[PDB]
Design a protein around this motif. Structure first.
Motif, PDB file in Angstrom:
ATOM      1  N   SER C   1      -2.952  63.878  94.490  1.00  0.00           N
ATOM      2  CA  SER C   1      -2.473  62.600  93.953  1.00  0.00           C
ATOM      3  C   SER C   1      -1.398  61.934  94.824  1.00  0.00           C
ATOM      4  O   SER C   1      -0.722  62.597  95.603  1.00  0.00           O
ATOM      5  N   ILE C   2      -1.255  60.608  94.694  1.00  0.00           N
ATOM      6  CA  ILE C   2      -0.296  59.805  95.472  1.00  0.00           C
ATOM      7  C   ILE C   2       0.469  59.029  94.420  1.00  0.00           C
ATOM      8  O   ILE C   2      -0.123  58.206  93.712  1.00  0.00           O
ATOM      9  N   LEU C   3       1.741  59.366  94.264  1.00  0.00           N
ATOM     10  CA  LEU C   3       2.589  58.866  93.196  1.00  0.00           C
ATOM     11  C   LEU C   3       3.852  58.212  93.679  1.00  0.00           C
ATOM     12  O   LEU C   3       4.370  58.546  94.733  1.00  0.00           O
ATOM     13  N   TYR C   4       4.338  57.252  92.898  1.00  0.00           N
ATOM     14  CA  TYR C   4       5.572  56.558  93.236  1.00  0.00           C
ATOM     15  C   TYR C   4       6.540  56.695  92.067  1.00  0.00           C
ATOM     16  O   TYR C   4       6.128  56.596  90.905  1.00  0.00           O
ATOM     17  N   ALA C   5       7.805  56.871  92.375  1.00  0.00           N
ATOM     18  CA  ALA C   5       8.867  56.951  91.383  1.00  0.00           C
ATOM     19  C   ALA C   5      10.010  56.062  91.888  1.00  0.00           C
ATOM     20  O   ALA C   5      10.441  56.183  93.017  1.00  0.00           O
ATOM     21  N   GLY C   6      10.417  55.107  91.083  1.00  0.00           N
ATOM     22  CA  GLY C   6      11.484  54.197  91.465  1.00  0.00           C
ATOM     23  C   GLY C   6      12.017  53.482  90.256  1.00  0.00           C
ATOM     24  O   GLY C   6      11.438  53.579  89.168  1.00  0.00           O
ATOM     25  N   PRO C   7      13.162  52.795  90.414  1.00  0.00           N
ATOM     26  CA  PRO C   7      13.733  52.083  89.266  1.00  0.00           C
ATOM     27  C   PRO C   7      12.861  50.905  88.906  1.00  0.00           C
ATOM     28  O   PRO C   7      12.294  50.273  89.796  1.00  0.00           O
ATOM     29  N   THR C   8      12.683  50.667  87.603  1.00  0.00           N
ATOM     30  CA  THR C   8      11.883  49.541  87.129  1.00  0.00           C
ATOM     31  C   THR C   8      12.764  48.647  86.248  1.00  0.00           C
ATOM     32  O   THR C   8      13.691  49.128  85.592  1.00  0.00           O
ATOM     33  N   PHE C   9      12.452  47.347  86.227  1.00  0.00           N
ATOM     34  CA  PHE C   9      13.155  46.374  85.382  1.00  0.00           C
ATOM     35  C   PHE C   9      12.607  46.540  83.974  1.00  0.00           C
ATOM     36  O   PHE C   9      13.341  46.478  82.997  1.00  0.00           O
ATOM     37  N   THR C  10      11.294  46.794  83.900  1.00  0.00           N
ATOM     38  CA  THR C  10      10.521  47.015  82.691  1.00  0.00           C
ATOM     39  C   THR C  10      10.615  48.480  82.242  1.00  0.00           C
ATOM     40  O   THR C  10      10.479  49.407  83.053  1.00  0.00           O
ATOM     41  N   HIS C  11      10.794  48.675  80.942  1.00  0.00           N
ATOM     42  CA  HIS C  11      10.768  49.998  80.363  1.00  0.00           C
ATOM     43  C   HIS C  11       9.795  50.006  79.218  1.00  0.00           C
ATOM     44  O   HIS C  11      10.097  49.511  78.126  1.00  0.00           O
ATOM     45  N   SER C  12       8.569  50.456  79.535  1.00  0.00           N
ATOM     46  CA  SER C  12       7.461  50.528  78.590  1.00  0.00           C
ATOM     47  C   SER C  12       7.725  51.681  77.632  1.00  0.00           C
ATOM     48  O   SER C  12       8.283  52.694  78.059  1.00  0.00           O
ATOM     49  N   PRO C  13       7.409  51.525  76.332  1.00  0.00           N
ATOM     50  CA  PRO C  13       7.718  52.604  75.377  1.00  0.00           C
ATOM     51  C   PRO C  13       6.817  53.816  75.536  1.00  0.00           C
ATOM     52  O   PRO C  13       5.728  53.703  76.073  1.00  0.00           O
TER      53      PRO C  13
END
Ligand SMILES: [Mg+2]
Lengths: 126, 230, 25
Positions: C1-13
């Protein structure tokens, strides 16, 4: 008509590269997260698809939507075949396809959700 | 797929996918636009360039300047705030890192490495890629330098978790079936003090800060492998 | 797998916040 040309600028060419059958973008919602309801397990699962939501119509005037995935090149393009299969439940848009195959959409802006719900119903109005 | 896209079509796609359709507050923030640009660059490098090697390798800053041109609403504004973009994106990119998640036969244990300090956290054996080596050969070398184990005969180029956090790309090859009695030792690393097996279900889902992002995909991978083995 | 982790403006529940689709019948 100006607002329609504004939302189609760039975006339509992008969507048509992937799905040339798409004729136009009807509406857009930013940051939509996709959930899937596991019937048989009776639980919601958060999918890896999150991105811009485009409500679209194809070259046969059939209504659908694309979520242009930020997380991978795998997007989600579904049709909305019957307006009654789209329900606004709490903070979500619930989309049922006949065989108990249900997706849930969370739109970052609550105003997009209620506008898109209406536009889905009116785009399918006959 | 992007195999037949022009470079301009690729930037159009990345603009629509990451920056053009943002809510106004996010789109007017240098910081928030930069987080989108960083993910767009990751998408370009790790997905799009894989389907078309004729597309140019771009540095994060060169990439950002090109992308802005495909977001009509932002080219001129991005030029006015050019210094802020230069500043935010400077030093954000890191040299790719490769290594391995070595599992025992039962896939219940994994090899983790740590430094001598109390503040130092556990991590998978890994390190920076050299100009010559392939991603796979980098992982083999790194695992050998940090654990004394040569995984060349076992490493599978198609079984890995490739994680990007901000600008740090970390690709770890998943290698099951490593014997539990393997004699691990730090060959040429002063920063590697402990090389030990850890039971996966004991790890938190903090001394494991670096490890935690890999645990969900690893557990999904193991679950899929256990089902496939049965 | 190829995954990204970073800060988001959106916070989905989290998926637990979604309602059970009782219109299933
Ligand atoms: Mg310097």
């Amino acid at each position: 008509e100006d607002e329609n040309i504004l939302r189609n600028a760039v975006n339509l060419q992008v969507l048509k590269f992937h799905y040339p059958e798409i004729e136009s973008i009807i509406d857009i919602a930013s940051h939509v997260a996709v959930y899937q309801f596991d019937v048989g397990s009776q639980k919601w699962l958060k999918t890896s698809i999150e991105g811009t939501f485009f409500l679209v119509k194809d070259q046969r005037a059939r209504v659908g939507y694309v979520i242009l995935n930020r997380n991978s090149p795998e997007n989600l393009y579904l049709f909305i075949n019957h307006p009654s299969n789209v329900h606004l439940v709490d903070r979500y848009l619930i989309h049922r396809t006949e065989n108990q195959h249900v997706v849930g959409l969370w739109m970052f802006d609550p105003n997009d959700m209620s506008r898109i719900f209406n536009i889905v119903k009116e785009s399918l109005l006959r | 797929s992007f195999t037949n896209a022009t470079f301009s079509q690729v930037l159009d796609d990345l603009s629509a996918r990451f920056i053009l359709n943002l809510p106004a507050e996010e789109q007017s923030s240098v910081e928030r636009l930069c987080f989108q640009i960083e993910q767009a660059h990751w998408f370009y490098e790790d997905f799009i360039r894989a389907q078309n090697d004729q597309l140019p390798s771009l540095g994060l800053r060169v990439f950002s300047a090109k992308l802005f041109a495909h977001c009509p609403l932002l080219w001129k504004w991005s030029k006015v705030h050019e210094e802020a973009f230069d500043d935010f994106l400077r030093y954000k990119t890191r040299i790719p890192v490769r290594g391995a998640i070595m599992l025992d036969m039962s896939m219940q244990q994994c090899v983790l490495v740590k430094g001598w300090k109390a503040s130092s956290g556990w991590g998978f054996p890994k390190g920076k890629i050299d100009k010559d080596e392939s991603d796979v050969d980098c992982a083999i070398r790194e695992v050998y330098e940090e654990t004394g184990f040569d995984c060349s005969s076992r490493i599978n180029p198609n079984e890995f978790i490739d994680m990007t956090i901000r600008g740090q790309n970390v690709r770890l090859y998943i290698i099951p079936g490593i014997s539990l009695d393997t004699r691990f030792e730090s060959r040429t690393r002063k920063e590697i003090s402990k090389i030990e097996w850890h039971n996966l279900m004991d790890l938190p889902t903090n001394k494991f800060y670096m490890v935690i992002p890999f645990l969900a995909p690893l557990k999904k991978w193991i679950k899929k492998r256990n089902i496939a083995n049965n | 797998s190829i995954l990204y982790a970073g800060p988001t403006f959106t916070h989905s529940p989290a998926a637990s916040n979604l309602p059970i689709p009782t219109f299933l019948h």
